[PDB]
Design a binder for this molecule. Sequence first.
Ligand code: IHP
Lengths: 574, 58, 51, 76
Amino acid sequence: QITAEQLLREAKEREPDELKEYQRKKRKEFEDGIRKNRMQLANWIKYGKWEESIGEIQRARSVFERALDVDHRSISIWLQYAEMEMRCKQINHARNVFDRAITIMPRAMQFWLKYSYMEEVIENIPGARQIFERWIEWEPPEQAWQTYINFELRYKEIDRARSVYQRFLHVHGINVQNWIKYAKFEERNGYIGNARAAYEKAMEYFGEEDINETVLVAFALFEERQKEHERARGIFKYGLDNLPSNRTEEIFKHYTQHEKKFGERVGIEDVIISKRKTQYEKMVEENGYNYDAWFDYLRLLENEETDREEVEDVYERAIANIPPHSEKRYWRRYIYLWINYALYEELVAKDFDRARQVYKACIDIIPHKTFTFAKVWIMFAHFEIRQLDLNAARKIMGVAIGKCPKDKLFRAYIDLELQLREFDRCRKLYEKFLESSPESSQTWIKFAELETLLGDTDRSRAVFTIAVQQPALDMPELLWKAYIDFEIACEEHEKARDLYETLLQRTNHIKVWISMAEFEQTIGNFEGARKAFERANQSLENAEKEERLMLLEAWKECETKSGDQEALKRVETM
Amino acid sequence: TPAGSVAATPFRDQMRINEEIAGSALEQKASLKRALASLPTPKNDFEVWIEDASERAE
Amino acid sequence: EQIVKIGHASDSVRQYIDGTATSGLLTDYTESARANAVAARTMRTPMLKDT
Amino acid sequence: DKSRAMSLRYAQLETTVGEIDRARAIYAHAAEISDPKVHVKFWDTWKNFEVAHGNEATVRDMLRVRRSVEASYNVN
Ligand SMILES: O=P(O)(O)O[C@H]1[C@H](OP(=O)(O)O)[C@@H](OP(=O)(O)O)[C@H](OP(=O)(O)O)[C@@H](OP(=O)(O)O)[C@H]1OP(=O)(O)O
């Protein structure tokens, strides 16, 4: 098809008196072109260039002098006019053109660069200096001074180049980099006494308060390069004081590199820790909600063995950042910001009366009617036990259960009273625990296990019987297992049998029927298992074939292990 | 689509060992209390590397 | 958060009790959870009431 | 090349967790920088997803983006 490309491609593809008389035609072409357009200056340049070539250079001057009357702020024309005079070798005319150009446009850089270069290529170099001297009178900004300096360096005048810098710093010296470049110029030539003077005068120039510390680091690193290193520490160390928060971020990165050699035992660890300390404080100023920054900060200060009052001020700053959401998913990291504080007060500061206040302040801050940290109530309880104050410890756990009855609290309180050999107090707490969480069959088992460990069988039986009477349980199977296993441990098989009887009266589930048979198999009353299997298999005629099969595989296991081939025929005809 | 699969992971109601009838929470609280108040109390229970950079310097 | 709480509680109980001579009365709480989870995974977007 | 691979990876997580509505937007967002003329393994795995976890109203949505995206490359 012939769409865009082929149509437009096809459209695209279609696409010496005689010399004197020719020259007259060109002049008319230029002059009439000038007449109409006037601001045409590109053609005004071409007419000037064209006349030049012919040796009509005398006329070409006339063209450019007319062209300058039209624009005069003409920097293209001025360049072309001078360059025309230079190629012609007119150099006094070329000088006159530049002397006009720089007079009329003293702040067009191009003329001073071009003019100094012309005189330099002629080896006029006294005159080339005078051009740069004349230029500097205009206070031209940076690049003019750098080009004059570089000019004197190419001659290797270096003390005259130094004079230019000293004047350059007077006009420009508000900019630090001019001082640093000056000092680097003195250093590299080897004048190093001048380089010290240059930095020290730069600091005196910028002052005491508005410390230009990029000078100070530059000064420090120069002295480091000298191997003055005592001076280099001094400069860095001096800077750290007056600079302390914001600008030290630069100082510390050089100061720590400095010490990384010479610091090695005491100097490295000091600067890195103090760097880290201010670096964590930056994170805390950005976001006091950054708990991971507080934990990492507190690690540093504890390994420092920092003075106690400073670590307390840092913990209490960290702790005041209570989560804004008031939902426990956000508190899970924040709560250890209190626990670490109590561990520090107990283990390191050893001020137990102040660790009470840490826990009271902690529990007065948790939104208990919405959620609790059982860790807090547990740790606060065990702390008073280490103070031998059971009355306080019981009050703590008591209000814990009273405000927010929670499983982790009950377990901890019960385990405490068990360790205290306060078995009758454990019992009262289990009854409260069961009232809290009645469905938790594990607690009914753990309650009966307490009674079993204390040797009161009839206590344990009454718990289990009241347990299996409950309208709901998380795992009746776990409880029925536990009570069967208990009656097996009593060897009162005639009651353990009754448990399977009542359990089977609750459900005809095949696994209960199997375990009823396996119970008789483990008594060794193997006929009871067969009578159970028959009682199951003859009654479960309406059970599923796989249910009956799983039942009858258990009997086939029974008879193949006993080896009664006559019974296996009965099994084979089940 | 309801994401049934993760919700399926918490297993519950393993076996029919229950009557599926329950009392109101306050009288169920009393049911435990009035039953578990029957638990006897028959007797009391008692049942009694090298420093060497640093080593030469120091 | 609720799901993983219930799951970890049930599984820990399973590991404590099981491996005893009167087991098998217990319905395999961790493995039955696995069996339930793989069965439920097949599911589809329903169409639309309006169309 | 890897962003498609990561899209298959991410869809496998959302489909095992059962966030099947998110899985479609993973595939559909990957389908626009895939072509059915050489990336057939991507379209097969999305097709095997949509026949399993999808239905007529979204299977046709798959076939719409398929013919749209191939048209982007098949300028001939
Ligand atoms: O409420 P519980 O069933 O008694 O579970 C608690 C509790 O978990 P919750 O978040 O559900 O309350 C603890 O959590 P906290 O209240 O202390 O935040 C938790 O402690 P961790 O959060 O420190 O894990 C503890 O687990 P562990 O004893 O391993 O610390 C766990 O107990 P379980 O192991 O009995 O579930």
